[PDB]
Design a protein around this ligand. Structure first.
Ligand SMILES: [Cl-]
Length: 290
């Protein structure tokens, strides 16, 4: 059985929570805290292990962006550190190809990264790869056919509808068709061989619209919108459905969790997080050992 894990986040300060939602019995399981409260991080899973990448520690004692990589083992309910990235990356995006973690974009202070680096778990080593054509913070990242896509974001001046595609074999980025909508802080994921971009912020409004990229047609198409507009949401796929968690709607830090069914093209609100928050890292892996 697999659960939806949400790590970190922001509500008045960065958070250390690790909680796991069971879509069947509806429970939230409170697990070992992050070593450091972090928001604006990303989550992913390699070899059953949950990784928390980047982010920022906003605390009443001071604020710092994070280069950290940390690993959670559900079999032991323990976190352990990994080697850090070359630079701190707040509002990062990540994707997994061939068992390697790609860290994309994000910010360090006023620096908006176009740089990208790759983590090899079997060596605990990071290595820089070719930088993106665009500086992107609040970038959404997805992997399709072992190509890495970076979608949207904020370049420090403009928010973006552009998307680009990384070919690992060429070590080269190439622009693709832009989204219909400018989005920073959207949730981006892959489902049934399409890239979905949900929500985000366009510099005026937080968004509820959702669009889907078909690589065969190189076209973005709108699908059903979410019930609640939200930026800095967490997103993941569990058993063929998309789940979006939390975020910010210009007024409150949401605890709403919505679920997209592709067969019916409908969003449903399925649970609430134990407290509202934005900027979480989210991923799916085996339930913890009791
Ligand atoms: Cl994430």
């Amino acid at each position: 059985g697999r659960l939806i894990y949400t790590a970190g986040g922001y509500f008045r300060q960065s958070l250390s929570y690790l909680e796991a939602y069971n879509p069947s019995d509806g429970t939230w399981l409170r697990l070992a805290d992050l070593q450091v409260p972090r928001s604006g991080l990303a989550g992913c899973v390699v070899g059953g292990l949950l990784y928390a990448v980047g982010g920022r520690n906003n605390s009443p004692d001071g604020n710092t962006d994070s280069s950290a990589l940390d690993c959670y083992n559900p079999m032991t309910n323990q976190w352990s550190p990994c080697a850090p990235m070359s630079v701190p990356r707040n509002r990062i995006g990540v994707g997994v190809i061939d068992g390697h973690i790609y860290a994309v974009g994000g910010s360090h202070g006023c620096i908006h990264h176009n740089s990208v680096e790759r983590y090899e778990p079997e060596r605990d080593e990071w290595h820089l790869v070719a930088p993106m054509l665009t500086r992107r913070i609040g970038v959404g990242v997805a992997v399709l056919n072992r190509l890495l896509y970076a979608v949207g974001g904020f370049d420090g001046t403009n928010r973006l509808n552009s998307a680009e595609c990384y070919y690992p074999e060429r070590n080269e980025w190439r622009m693709i068709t832009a989204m219909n909508t400018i989005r920073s802080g959207a949730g981006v994921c892959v489902l049934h061989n399409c890239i979905y971009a949900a929500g985000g912020y366009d510099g005026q409004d937080q968004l509820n619209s959702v669009e889907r990229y078909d690589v065969a047609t190189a076209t973005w198409t709108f699908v059903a919108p979410m019930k609640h507009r939200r930026s800095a949401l967490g997103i993941t796929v569990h058993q063929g459905r998309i789940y979006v968690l939390g975020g910010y709607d210009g007024h409150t830090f949401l605890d709403s969790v919505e679920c997209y069914d592709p067969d019916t093209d409908t969003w449903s609100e399925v649970t609430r997080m134990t407290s509202g928050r934005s900027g979480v890292g989210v991923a799916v892996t085996m339930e913890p050992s009791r």
